[PDB]
């Protein structure tokens, strides 16, 4: 039961990397060119887009994917250059911490949906203005799916922690 | 008779992978930039495009392609790390289920054609408006072809299910 | 005399694949953005382009190239997994049939030239309107060249069929 | 003296292929989007561009590069599958003929310069109109350089023909 | 304690290279097309963009990444071609110097944030004008993160310098 | 002292290759689309851009990079096919000549800076007009850096010439 957990963990991790590398690069491609606000102000479009989407989903996901894979490279470099079980335990702890932190950060940054309308009141805009997002449903689907995958990985890492940890 | 079926399953699967990777990436390239509605409303174009095409065909097809290939990687990782016939049976069942689910989902999401006109009545649009789709015939051809290929794969997997299953 | 024919068949097949992969991807790149109609109607451009070019030449050619190479992969998978001469004969028959069918289909779909003007009378256009095609001469040259190459391949396959067949 | 000719021929051939693959793909990138005519006629821009540049330089050069390398693949396939000196002589004759034909065709199609102005009188344009070409000097430089390289290759092939031929 | 420092130095270096190669290429993609100024002057947009962003962040970072890796290639070429400890010491000194210089240069060129507004008074603009930057928050995040990573690398190199140096 | 010179020559050459291949391809990407002139004349933009930038910097640099590496391939092909020291001496002389010629040509074509304004008086423009260049500072930095690198390579080649030559 604990044996299959590693196979499912590696498969989900590679699955996530593949999804992000192959499909995510192109849903967000036109994020800002298709974002439009009802206004005649130069620079209101830029300001309101920046306020609505401070960091794009795909940037956060690439960063998270790369950062949650760093203990593996550290352990590999340590072993190739040269306790070792001590390294295994610490890298497992670190991966668990990183994945819980990244999941919580995703929840706090983005929530669970991307709405189609946005109300912005930042300079140079005059009082509050209404702006319109491109492809909200697809981005919501991607958000929910990525949350599910990250939850799966967190669950597996907690499983292994409780299996080895005392 | 059942022997050649595996070779034809492998060939159809690789054929589908190639078709999606080489051709699908560029029929849908201009899906939203060429989508136009008869209106003077900012944000009506975005809303009506999102309502007409919630998830693009090529996104669904890439996701399906990746998801219907996961039992193979699971089995491979299980064998490389280390009954085995039990794994073969379960992964066959899982592939069958996944392909039937994906085919039914395709039918329920997209139907059998992509019309050239679309009637949309979502905010910020004023009552119902008419919008025009880009490349409807090519997308219809792609839809029908992919449905045919997925049906072929489902048929083959059911064949093997009934051959081994009791 | 029949020996060199196989070498020339292999060379023409690889030649065709190379031509399509390297050059064809970029003549058709701006097919719809440069297509223009003399009208003030929203959506007439989309409708008339779709009626003039239901499936782009390069899509048909990529599909044909991939489909005329499937017997080779089938035979290879059959041999790697494990009469064999029976497989050779059947795959030769199948390749011949596929190439004659694809050549006839090309002739029936596209003809021998791409005109510079197109007259369209599809909704939402008001009566018949005139539209203008981009790069007609280059596309005509490509059409004629591809027809010639496909004819060469058909001729070679019929030659070998009559050499082996009785 | 005849020994070094082979080394210089292979080096010039690879040099030409590299130049075309790395740099030529991007001088011609904006050929039609930057082409402009002094007129208010829809479709005059397309017609006059097609009349001024029936086949783009880079398309002809890629086709020529691929076609002048076909005897090498034919000879290689003939040798891998299995007089041989007879094949060497014939492929040398064929390469010579192909390169002289391609050089003459280049001269007859394009000349020695690309002018900055073009005068066009094709339908739908009203009488003669003036159009303006993008990047004429760079294209002239490329034309002259490619003519020089092709001349070098022709000279080398004639040298070797006269060395072996009687 | 000094042993593990090398593993983290190599891992941080590869981490930084990966981040720059995979994600940085596309935040800055639309830097100038989305930059807009409140004016009716031709050429004011170009002048004010050039004054606000003389060298793009990603250009500086790629240059720095490549330049801080030159001692490694020099040492490798020296060893493959053929004291050696003398080379190790000098290349360590050189890497330390290069990374401190690059960090200070980053601080002096860019600071710690990218503001959303810019005030420009360069010809051809009439007196001072206001311009608006695209994606300021993401660029600020990237700036701060890269500063942190470069600081980490500087710290590690100083650590090892003081470990070996006397 | 003369031993390390070869290592530094190979490292600087590879460094230059990398800089041109990775970063230079994208500073010049929008060279003509962002070039603008203060005028209402069709075709004045094209003419004045062509007069200001006859050959783009990156085209010259790629050509130079490829041309200064041809003696190496010639020598390699000569050795693989089969005095040899005579070849070494001649190829060194040829590389020296090529690099001095290319450096002088760069100086005569481009100078040491790219100005932000350009004054053009070519047909179809009416008398002299003012045009505005995109990204002048970055292009000036690139110019100066490439001049420095090419000077370094020239210096090294002259060093080796005088070391071996008499």
Numbering used by the authors:
A (entry chain F), B (entry chain A), C (entry chain B), D (entry chain C), E (entry chain E), F (entry chain D): 19 to 100, 194 to 277
Lines from the paper:
Connexin 36 (Cx36) is responsible for signal transmission in electrical synapses by forming interneuronal gap junctions. Cx36 is mainly expressed in neurons and forms the major component of GJCs in electrical synapses, playing important roles in cognitive functions, including memory consolidation and epileptogenesis. Here, we determine cryo-electron microscopy structures of Cx36 GJC at 2.2–3.6 Å resolutions, revealing a dynamic equilibrium between its closed and open states.
This process led to the selection of 14,155 GJC particles with two hemichannel regions each belonging to the PLN and FN groups, 3D reconstruction of which with C6 symmetry produced a conformationally hetero-junctional GJC structure at 3.34 Å resolution. Compared with the GJC structures in the full PLN and FN states, the map density of the hemichannel region in the PLN state was weaker because of the smaller number of particles used for reconstruction, but that in the FN state was significantly improved in the cytoplasmic half of the TMD, as we expected. It should be noted that the hetero-junctional GJC structure is not the main conformation in the Cx36Nano-WT GJC sample, but is the average of only 13% selected particles, which are still conformationally heterogeneous. In the hetero-junctional structure of Cx36Nano-WT GJC, the hemichannel in the FN state had two flat layers of density blobs blocking the pores around the cytoplasmic and extracellular ends of TM1 or TM2. To avoid artifacts from C6 symmetry imposed during 3D reconstruction, we confirmed that the pore-obstructing densities were also present in the density map reconstructed without imposed symmetry. The features of the pore-obstructing densities, including double layers, flatness, and a thickness of ~4 nm, are highly consistent with those observed in the pore-occluded structures of the Innexin-6 hemichannel and pannexin 1 channel, suggesting that Cx36 GJC in the FN state may also be obstructed by lipids.
